[PDB]
């Protein structure tokens, strides 16, 4: 039994999207399908349900106007369509369902999530700049280094250090959207300062959407 949703999308404002969600393992037409929205770092919010047997939908007023949910029993997949896209529609969209509850419309089964981003921004790889302290003396025996990963779009990026060799003490921060319309984050790592720069700390950044692997040797 699984719900598999369609892939992340990047959409201009005023466009329309149709996310799908396909069901293996059970009879779609015997149960309800619900879609739910989760705005970046906000709560879940119920959009609407559909009865695949009937075609009968109910919505939340918030969402009635601009969202249409439909279901195709021939492919056992349920679709969700927002029209008139808008930056605030950027959120993860979930199909969900209940069929082993045995007493209620509570949802025991959910999809991966499907990320919709609405932006006028164009696809663009990141520029990478090293974060090291001024000098040098420095700490001890403890210093922080890092990587400013700035001006890229869309998400996501993969940061790593020393091609994976270094994982302890490393924190890569939740990306942040700037007024550019572009994303900027940074990755940092705590290290022992006596060991610096005996060891080099390279920092590998990967932005698949713009085919971009880049690399910074970081040094104070």
């Amino acid at each position: 039994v699984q719900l598999v949703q369609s892939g992340a999308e990047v959409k201009k404002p005023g466009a329309t999207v149709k996310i799908s969600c396909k069901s293996s393992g059970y009879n779609i037409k015997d149960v309800y399908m619900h879609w739910v929205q989760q705005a970046p770092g906000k709560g879940l919010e119920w959009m609407g349900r559909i009865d695949p047997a009937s075609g009968d939908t109910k919505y939340d007023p918030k969402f009635q106007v601009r969202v249409t949910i439909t279901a195709d029993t021939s492919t056992d997949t349920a679709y969700m369509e927002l029209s008139s896209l808008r930056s605030e529609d950027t959120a993860v969209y979930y199909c969900a369902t209940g069929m082993w509850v045995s007493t209620g419309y509570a949802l025991d089964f959910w999809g991966q999530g499907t990320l919709v981003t609405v932006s006028s921004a164009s696809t663009k790889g990141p520029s990478v700049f090293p974060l090291a302290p001024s000098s040098k003396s420095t700490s001890g025996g403890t210093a922080a280094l890092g990587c400013l990963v700035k001006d890229y779009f869309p998400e996501p990026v993969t940061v790593s250090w020393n091609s994976g060799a270094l994982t302890s003490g490393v924190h890569t921060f939740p990306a942040v959207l700037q007024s550019s319309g572009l994303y900027s984050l940074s990755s940092v790592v705590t290290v022992p300062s006596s060991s610096l720069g005996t060891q080099t700390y390279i920092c590998n950044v990967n932005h698949k959407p713009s085919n971009t692997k880049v690399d910074k040797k970081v040094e104070p």
Partner: protein, 213 residues
């Protein structure tokens, strides 16, 4: 159009303590309520349905109660894997509204951050903008204040923050603030300092550099 208000908004309990979230419905809702658990990245999980029925597989720690307008979820003895956001949901009527969620987090001894400051790379100054970066890593609790000052002048609209999820081993948080300004502004001014205020600090810690050193 039924509104599910849950409280607290954030709960911090020691490993093995009890955890009480509860939920208030705007309108009598009978037994028709579920709770869910969500973790970063993952889709949600159903824990209780019909106000007090464990979905099979969910362990005994979790139990729900109440009927009508006042409902509660209990976690007998919190464990490492129970850190998540906890949501309340009504299936009584027309729009099946969720609550806003309660963040449940491991209580830890207090710890102040270690503050570090980074000047901009010459590599970036070529493009004509300067990002100064202040990093407070490994602190608890999350509540932290951070002010930028350029030559003693409180900066206001020109910086942005980001915060990690609580750490698996440490149970701690790290935060970075980034001050953006132009190459001109950066080259005219001289002292760049971030100043950090936090429970574990007995009074604010300033980290600062002067451009020309």
């Amino acid at each position: 159009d039924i509104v599910m208000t849950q409280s607290p908004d954030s709960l911090a309990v020691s490993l093995g303590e009890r955890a009480t979230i509860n939920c208030k419905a705007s309108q009598s809702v009978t037994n028709d309520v579920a709770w869910y658990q969500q973790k970063p990245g993952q889709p949600p999980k159903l824990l209780i349905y019909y106000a007090s029925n464990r979905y099979t597989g969910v362990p005994d720690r979790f139990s729900g109660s109440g009927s009508g307008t006042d409902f509660t979820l209990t976690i007998s003895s919190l464990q490492a894997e129970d850190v998540a956001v906890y949501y309340c949901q009504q299936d009584y009527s027309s729009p099946y509204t969720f609550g806003q969620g309660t963040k449940v987090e491991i209580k830890r001894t207090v710890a102040a951050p270690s503050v570090f400051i980074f000047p901009p790379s010459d590599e970036q100054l070529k493009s004509g903008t300067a990002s100064v970066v202040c990093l407070l890593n490994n602190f608890y609790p999350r509540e932290a204040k951070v002010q930028w000052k350029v030559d003693n002048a409180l900066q206001s609209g020109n910086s942005q923050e980001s915060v990690t999820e609580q750490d698996s081993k440490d149970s701690t948080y790290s935060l970075s603030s980034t001050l953006t300004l132009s190459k001109a502004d950066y080259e005219k001014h001289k002292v760049y300092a971030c100043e950090v205020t936090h429970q574990g600090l007995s009074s604010p810690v300033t980290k600062s550099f002067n451009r020309g050193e």
